[PDB]
Amino acid sequence: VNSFSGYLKLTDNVYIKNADIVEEAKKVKPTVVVNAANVYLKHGGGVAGALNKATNNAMQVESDDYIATNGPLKVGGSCVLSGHNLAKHCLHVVGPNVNKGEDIQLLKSAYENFNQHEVLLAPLLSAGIFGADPIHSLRVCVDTVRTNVYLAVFDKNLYDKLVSSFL
Numbered sequence: 001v002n003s004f005s006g007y008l009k010l011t012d013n014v015y016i017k018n019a020d021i022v023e024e025a026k027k028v029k030p031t032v033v034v035n036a037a038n039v040y041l042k043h044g045g046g047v048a049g050a051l052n053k054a055t056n057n058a059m060q061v062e063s064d065d066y067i068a069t070n071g072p073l074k075v076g077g078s079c080v081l082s083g084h085n086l087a088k089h090c091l092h093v094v095g096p097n098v099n100k101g102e103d104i105q106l107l108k109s110a111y112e113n114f115n116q117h118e119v120l121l122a123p124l125l126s127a128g129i130f131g132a133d134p135i136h137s138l139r140v141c142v143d144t145v146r147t148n149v150y151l152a153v154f155d156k157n158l159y160d161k162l163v164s165s166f167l
């Protein structure tokens with residue numbers, strides 16, 4: 001039993017809700033919140049920009065030190081950093097950004113990072129300003145993640161389409 005509330009159950013391990021991931025995180029304080037990161041951990045917009053704003057830019061400060069030490073992530077890769085005031089940890093995951101021409105096949109690799117964590121609060125990878133088809137992102141999530149994932153979808157309209165079209 002966990003404190004995630006109001007989620008629809010899609011499969012044995014995947015749950016979904018219309019919610020602002022920032023407000024979900026502040027309420028639940030999950031062990032892991034997933035960020036929709038880019039390889040430079042530049043948290044400018046979309047989920048990343050919102051999550052960082054909620055940390056008063058502390059996420060960006062920590063991220064800049066990470067990059068200065070380690071260099072950029074790989075597309076499809078991840079790193080674990082602090083969750084600041086939102087969660088114990090933040091798993092920064094880089095899905096392919098279609099608007100940069102990146103290989104959508106890398107979306108499966110991106111979701112594989114979730115399997116290193118027993119429970120996560122997450123957005124759909126490569127959705128929103130990353131330009132991928134969210135119905136496809138949900139499908140890849142369900143077919144790749146085996147650990148317990150709680151998906152927050154910001155747009156109420158989009159949520160209804162994902163539920164109604166879920167096979």
Ligand SMILES: O=C(O)[C@@H]1CCCN1S(=O)(=O)c1cccc2c1NSN2
Binds near residue numbers: 019
């Ligand atoms: O729901 C949305 O408006 C957009 C468009 C498609 C998916 N999302 S999102 O970019 O992942 C996103 C951005 C900021 C906050 C949250 C989400 N999801 S949940 N909270």
